[PDB]
Amino acid sequence: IPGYTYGETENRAPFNLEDLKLLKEAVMFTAEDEEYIQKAGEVLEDQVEEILDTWYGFVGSHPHLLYYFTSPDGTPNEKYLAAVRKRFSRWILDTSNRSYDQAWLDYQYEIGLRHHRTKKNQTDNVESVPNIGYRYLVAFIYPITATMKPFLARKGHTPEEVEKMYQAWFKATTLQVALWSYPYVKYGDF
């Protein structure tokens, strides 16, 4: 997967496992959510293309959101969209599969950097807009969480298990966006 450097950034994030413990406590993420986000694994594995169709559909239907993938001339950069799509697809699996350990935190830092002007457009060597305004990362917690529910509900598991998977996904999405604020936030205010 071009540009995907999980576990090999060779850069230790400015947050550690103690920070993560406290952040998990604030978002109410426990061992129960680890169990159920992992069960979401097998459920979502075969559906990732349809999930990305939904998410890219949402972005593409809103000029002010599609903006973030545009070339200077205002048209969508198709190379950029396609390359990011492969990494975004993989993130769905990583969220369900990966242990949230230091390697995971180091990639969280990287993902935040890539939305921020610090590293945006470098991974794919594209010319596009310099920064994704942080307000929209937070806003996206809702669509990224809520649009996942129909996909969780399809694989013939109990509605009770689906609800637990869904709450785990909401917490995990929130947790990650909180971490991605680091490069946006004034030093010492994070």
Residues in contact with ligand HEM by the rule CB under 6 A: 3-4, 59, 65, 68-69, 84, 87-88, 91, 111, 114-115, 120-121, 123, 132, 136-137, 140-141, 144, 173, 177
Spatial distance between the Cα atoms of 163 and 188, rounded to a whole number of angstroms? 37
Q: Which of 135, 156, 158, 159 binds a second copy (CB under 8 A)?
A: 135
Determine if 128 is a binding residue for a second copy (CB under 8 A).
no
Q: Which does 62 bind (CB under 5 to 8 A by kind): a second copy, ligand HEM, none?
A: a second copy
Alpha carbon separation from 170 to 2, 36, 135, 163, 167 (Å, rounded): 28, 12, 18, 11, 5
Nearer to a second copy, 86 or 163 (CB): 163
What does the DSSP 8-state code read for residue 46?
A: G
- Minimum distance of a second copy from residue 5's CB (angstroms): 23
Spatial distance between the Cα atoms of 174 and 120, rounded to a whole number of angstroms? 21
Nearer to ligand HEM, 141 or 153 (CB): 141
CB count within 10 Å of CB 186 equals: 6
Determine if 43 is a binding residue for a second copy (CB under 8 A).
no
Q: Which does 186 bind (CB under 5 to 8 A by kind): a second copy, ligand HEM, none?
A: a second copy
- Assess contact for 173 and 134: CB atoms under 8 A: no
What does the DSSP 8-state code read for residue 67?
A: G
Spatial distance between the Cα atoms of 25 and 23, rounded to a whole number of angstroms? 5
- Minimum distance of ligand HEM from residue 160's CB (angstroms): 26
**What's the gap between Cα 63 and its chain centre?**
21
| Backbone torsions φ then ψ of 131, nearest 5 degrees | -150, 145
Binding site for a second copy (CB under 8 A): 22-23, 25-28, 62, 64-65, 116-117, 131, 133-136, 138-143, 146, 167, 170-171, 174-175, 177-179, 181-182, 184-186, 188-190
